[PDB]
C-alpha cells in the first residue's frame, strides 16, 4: 500500500472509487441474474403467474430508496418501512415473501450486510492504506442502491417470461 501521507494518495483515491463502482455494478448484476439470489437477499420471488410482492410494491420501495444518498438517510428508509409495517393490509402485501420486510430492514441497517451479500474481494481493487474501510464507509449508500435496483430490474425480466 501507499503510505496515507504519500502525495499521490489523493490521486489513487480516484482510481479506487472508479474500479470499485464498476465491480459493484457487475457483481450486483450477477446476483440479480439468479432467481434464488433475489429470494435470498430480498425475499422477492415468482409463484405461478404472480410476483411477490406486486411490482407496484417494489416500485414504491424503489422510489423511496433513491433518497438513500448517505448512511444517515437510513432514517428515511427505516421510517418508510415502519410506516409501511403499521398498516396491516400493506404489511400482508409482503406476506408470501421470504421475510422480505425484515430482510430489507437488515440490509438498510447492518453496515456489513451489503458487503457480505455482494462478496467482493476488494484486495485487488485497493491500494491505499486503510482504503478498504475508507471506501466501504464511503460507497455503502451507493452499494445498496445498486444492488436493490439490479434485483428489482432483473426480477422484472423473469416475471415477463412467466407472465
Amino acid at each position: 500500500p501507499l503510505p496515507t501521507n504519500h502525495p499521490t494518495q489523493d490521486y489513487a483515491r480516484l482510481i479506487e472509487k472508479a474500479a470499485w463502482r464498476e465491480a459493484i455494478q457487475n457483481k450486483a448484476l450477477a446476483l440479480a441474474s439468479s432467481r434464488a439470489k433475489r429470494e435470498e437477499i430480498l425475499g422477492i420471488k415468482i409463484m405461478g403467474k404472480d410476483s411477490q410482492p406486486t411490482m407496484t410494491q417494489l416500485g414504491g420501495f424503489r422510489s423511496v430508496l433513491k433518497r438513500l444518498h448517505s448512511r444517515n438517510n437510513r432514517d428515511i428508509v427505516t421510517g418508510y418501512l415502519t410506516a409501511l409495517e403499521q398498516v396491516s393490509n400493506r404489511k400482508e402485501k409482503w406476506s408470501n415473501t421470504s421475510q422480505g420486510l425484515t430482510k430489507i430492514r437488515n440490509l438498510v441497517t447492518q453496515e456489513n450486510l451489503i458487503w457480505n451479500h455482494l462478496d467482493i474481494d476488494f484486495s485487488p481493487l485497493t491500494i491505499t492504506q486503510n482504503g478498504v474501510n475508507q471506501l466501504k464507509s464511503e460507497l455503502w449508500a451507493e452499494a445498496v442502491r445498486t444492488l436493490v435496483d439490479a434485483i428489482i430490474r432483473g426480477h422484472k425480466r423473469d416475471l415477463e417470461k412467466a407472465q
Partner: protein, 340 residues
C-alpha cells in the same frame, strides 16, 4: 439555456517584449468590454418569442416522482439558485402542445392512430417540423430537431431547501405537517393563509355496494391551489423552419397558422396541464399572449403584437385571412411540406 456574466478580456501583446513578459508575470492588459460592444449592433437571428401569461384556475402541478409519508401526492419542486421553487418542466408544456397540435392535424385529415404504435402516432405533418422527429436512418434520415422550444416554468413562490424537506418528511396531516406548511407558505402565524396557498385534501374510492371507503383506497393530495406562476416562454426558431422549407418563406404560413390554432385552444382552456387533468386539476386561464418576432420575413410582421382575446382577434384580420387562405390551401393537399 446558458448566459454569460462578468465578462473580462485580458490582452497580451505577444509580438513584443512587454506583452510576452506580461503574459509570463503580469497577467495581461485589462480591456473594458463596453467599448467593443459599442462598435457593433447585436445581429440576432430570425426568431419568434411567445410569452404566455397565465395562472392556475384549478390547482396545477406535476407530480413529484415519489410519494410522501403524510401526503401521498406532492408537487414537483426544483432548485433555483439558493431556493427551491415549484416547477412545470418544459417537456410537459411541449407535450400537451404537441398533443393538441397532433389532434388538430389528424382531425382535419380524419387520420387514425388507434392501429399505429406509439412511435407511428408521433410522426405526422407540420408537427414533425415544429416539434421534431427521432433520428431514424431509412434507405435518408427522417429525424430532425424540433424548431419549437419551451422553457421550464417556475412558481413565483420560493422556499429554502430545508423548509420543503420539512413538508416531505412530515408524517401527520393534523400534526407536524401544519407547522411545515405554515413555514413553507411563509405564513408561520396564520394557517388559513397557508391553506389558501397549499391545501391538503383527502380522496376515497366508494365501494358500489357498501358505500364508504373501499379497503385501502384512502389517499391525499397537496393541492397547490394558490401557487402563482411566472409567464410561460415559448420560443420558436423561425430560422430552423426556413431551412426545413428550403427557404420558401411562403411555406412557413401553414405551420405558423397551426401554431396560432394551438395557442387559440390553449387560451380557451381546452389544454389542461400537469397531473390529474381528469380529476379536478390542471385547467389554466391565459390572460395575455405576447408575440415578439425579430428579423421576421416581412409577410409575418403583423405577429409583433400582444393579444388578450382568446380568439386572437387582436391580430389583424387581413393577416389572419392570409394565413387562413394558405392554411385551407394546405388542408386541401396535406403534402409533406418539408419535402421540396
Amino acid at each position: 439555456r446558458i448566459k454569460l456574466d462578468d465578462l473580462k478580456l485580458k490582452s497580451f501583446a505577444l509580438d513584443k517584449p512587454e506583452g510576452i513578459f506580461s503574459a509570463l508575470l503580469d497577467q495581461g492588459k485589462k480591456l473594458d468590454w463596453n467599448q467593443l460592444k459599442a462598435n457593433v449592433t447585436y445581429q440576432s437571428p430570425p426568431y419568434l418569442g411567445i410569452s404566455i401569461t397565465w395562472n392556475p384556475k384549478d390547482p396545477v402541478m406535476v407530480k413529484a416522482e415519489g410519494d410522501g409519508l403524510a401526503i401521498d401526492i406532492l408537487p414537483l419542486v426544483s432548485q433555483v439558485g439558493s431556493d427551491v421553487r415549484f416547477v412545470i418542466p418544459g417537456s410537459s408544456i411541449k407535450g400537451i402542445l404537441r398533443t393538441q397540435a397532433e389532434r388538430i392535424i389528424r382531425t382535419i385529415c380524419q387520420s387514425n392512430g388507434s392501429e399505429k404504435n406509439f412511435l407511428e402516432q408521433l410522426r405526422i405533418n407540420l408537427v414533425n417540423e415544429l416539434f421534431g422527429s427521432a433520428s431514424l436512418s431509412q434507405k435518408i434520415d427522417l429525424g430532425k430537431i424540433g424548431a419549437l422550444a419551451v422553457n421550464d416554468c417556475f412558481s413565483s413562490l420560493s422556499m429554502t431547501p430545508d423548509q420543503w424537506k420539512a413538508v416531505e418528511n412530515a408524517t401527520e396531516m393534523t400534526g407536524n405537517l401544519q407547522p411545515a406548511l405554515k413555514q413553507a407558505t411563509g405564513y408561520p402565524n396564520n394557517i388559513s393563509q397557508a391553506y389558501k396557498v397549499l391545501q391538503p385534501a383527502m380522496h376515497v374510492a366508494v365501494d358500489r355496494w357498501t358505500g364508504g371507503a373501499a379497503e385501502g383506497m384512502l389517499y391525499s393530495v397537496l393541492e397547490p391551489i394558490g401557487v402563482t406562476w411566472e409567464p410561460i416562454q415559448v420560443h420558436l426558431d423561425i430560422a430552423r423552419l426556413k431551412n426545413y422549407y428550403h427557404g420558401k418563406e411562403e411555406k412557413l404560413k401553414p405551420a405558423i397558422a397551426l401554431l396560432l390554432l394551438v395557442l387559440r385552444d390553449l387560451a380557451n382552456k381546452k389544454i389542461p396541464v400537469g397531473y390529474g387533468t381528469n380529476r379536478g386539476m390542471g385547467t389554466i386561464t391565459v390572460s395575455q399572449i405576447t408575440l415578439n418576432g425579430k428579423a421576421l420575413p416581412t409577410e409575418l410582421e403583423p405577429l409583433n403584437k400582444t393579444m388578450t382575446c382568446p380568439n386572437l382577434t387582436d391580430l389583424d384580420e387581413a393577416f389572419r385571412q392570409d394565413l387562413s387562405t394558405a392554411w385551407k390551401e394546405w388542408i386541401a393537399d396535406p403534402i409533406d411540406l418539408c419535402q421540396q
